[PDB]
Design a protein around this ligand. Structure first.
Ligand code: NAI
Ligand code: NAI
Lengths: 310, 310
């Protein structure tokens, strides 16, 4: 019933706090001692901050949650009595493959071997492993403590049990898992994100709207609805049901989509134009970027609270 | 300094409440007496509801705001002393053209003639009008009282003054206007929306994810960020600035985008599959659709409050 975090970096620390809120004993393992010390320190500080703002997940006190998080130096011992291992090392294929191969030689047939990978495919990560049926990608969204989505991406040989157990576990710790039925480049979130970016880029390039105004169309417009309801249910409600929406607007959708330009090169004049507008709003230096991210995260924290209430 | 609403229907009522919150005297005009009576009644009720939940815009009491809203039977008299006329009749080109032609013969050179049209282009709406320099499309987003975005779409002959004045007026009543520099099919919001829908549709069709799970990827994931920050600034912050983001992810974006399938037909098997999933979540009947929209709107109302606070 214990959980093991391999790599106590940024995402590993978030996972640690999520699992602890669910009452799970969490073990932290890292190749760098300073990352473990830093993780325990930051987790304690973040936990207290959340407590003070009444933003802690679950019903366990910050104190009890912190007591559930410890570190292990020996991997072989670290996997003892663990039912879920969440890998959180850098986004590097060679490295992740090595990690899973090392785990593959010491785990039993019960434990789920889960990767936090942002884009690497399960087929490239787990093929050839003895315990491949227990492998899966459980991709969170930064910042995981505020954004609940977790993309569960299976390997073609991943067992239904592994997917079901992980879906249930993610739900248990307060996250919102989704079943990506078949692996695909960019999974689901990034494919949707890139779809938006592609059209937005061309709109700016063609002089339809300034970069700043395009962002407003989303943040003070379309994005507000998307924080509560997806694009499909949105159609469903903006007419008398999905059938009605297609009957009324499918012609227009096809017409607009047919007018879409080519795939952007993401460089040259347009990157300069977009970057200039972005830097005007938020200077591209460590201080201003961090400050804006902090604001963004606070917004997400409050939105998370609002969503739970609704 | 007065405002005239032509067509006191759903959007006309929203506009009336927006302008009144800004302290503007609002005149309602409609070809159907029952729509005026219904508008005054619903506005009064909505105003009181907002007041009770502490959701009224501006610093004027619900009582004072309501006193600023009245009706006129004669259009010629209705345009007297008005600086902005917001047309809110049905989305029908022949009809809107007739409305603007009727206004064109009685207004001065100061008043702005603004259409709420959801998709009709300024070139089709205002060409040939004597007062074309004063024409513009000011497209709000339902529900306008909670979603601030207003797309300002000009006619090629629309004067800068007309655009500037309307931008300032929209900002004065608490809305978030954007300057769509050149008219285009679907303006900006719908082009972005359709971009998302197109990819989402193919993902469901190809069995990558269920309709319900796809919606969750947005509502409990990507959509949360988009409620505060647009797609471009999002890139800017998810790396060390826009340049950094493109350097790190442009290759992947192009690769994913290149894999995108063709434009959907929005019918057949997939429409049946999507509709079935949507109806399972929200039955396609008047009662359940209205209930879900009510929930959605309440979420947006609270999000609007949250955004203003942040
Ligand atoms: N930062 C976030 O919020 C998110 C991260 N991701 C993914 O999660 C993974 C980790 O990301 P981050 O935390 O941002 O990076 P990071 O660099 O902060 O953390 C990686 C951790 O891995 C440790 N590590 C390196 N080699 C190791 C080894 N052989 N054995 C054990 N530990 C080792 C490092 O010491 C470090 O603490 C990546 O694949 C990333 O794409 C997914 C979603 C969001
Ligand atoms: N409902 C909303 O929230 C939004 C509406 N839109 C656009 O706003 C426009 C109006 O939409 P709705 O309020 O939903 O429809 P609606 O049908 O409720 O309102 C139209 C009003 O026009 C009046 N009308 C019809 N012919 C007239 C004439 N010759 N002179 C004066 N009044 C006349 C009708 O009596 C009715 O009260 C459309 O072009 C729509 O696409 C834009 C954004 C959102």
């Amino acid at each position: 019933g214990d959980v093991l975090i391999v790599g106590s970096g940024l995402v590993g620390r978030s996972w640690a706090m999520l699992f602890a809120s669910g009452g799970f004993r969490v073990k932290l393992y890292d190749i760098e001692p300073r990352q473990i010390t830093g993780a325990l320190e930051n987790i304690r500080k973040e936990m207290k901050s959340l407590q003070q703002s009444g933003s802690l997940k679950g019903s366990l006190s910050a104190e009890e949650q912190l007591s559930l998080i410890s570190s292990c130096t020996n991997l072989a011992e670290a996997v003892e009595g663990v039912v879920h291992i969440q890998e959180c090392v850098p986004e590097n294929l060679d490295l992740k493959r090595k990690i899973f191969a090392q785990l593959d030689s010491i785990v039993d047939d019960r434990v789920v071997l889960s990767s936090s990978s942002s884009c690497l495919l399960p087929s490239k990560l787990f093929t050839g492993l003895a315990h491949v049926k227990q492998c899966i990608v459980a991709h969170p969204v930064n910042p995981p403590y505020y954004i609940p989505l977790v993309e569960l991406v299976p390997h073609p040989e991943t067992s239904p049990a592994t997917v079901d157990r992980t879906h249930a576990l993610m739900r248990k710790i307060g996250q919102s898992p989704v079943r990506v039925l078949k692996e695909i480049d960019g999974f689901v979130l990034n494919r949707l994100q890139y779809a938006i970016i592609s059209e937005a880029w061309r709109l700016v390039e063609e002089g339809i709207v300034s970069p700043s105004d395009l962002d407003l169309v989303m943040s003070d417009g379309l994005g507000m609805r998307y924080a509560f309801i997806g694009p499909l249910e949105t159609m469903h409600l903006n007419a008398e049901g999905m059938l009605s929406y297609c009957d009324r607007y499918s012609e227009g959708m096809k017409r607009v989509l047919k007018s879409f330009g080519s795939i952007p090169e993401f460089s040259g004049a347009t990157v300069e134009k977009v970057n200039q507008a972005m830097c005007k709003k938020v200077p591209a230096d460590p201080e201003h970027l961090a400050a804006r991210r902090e604001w963004r995260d606070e917004c997400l924290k409050r939105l998370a609270k609002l969503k739970r209430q609704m």
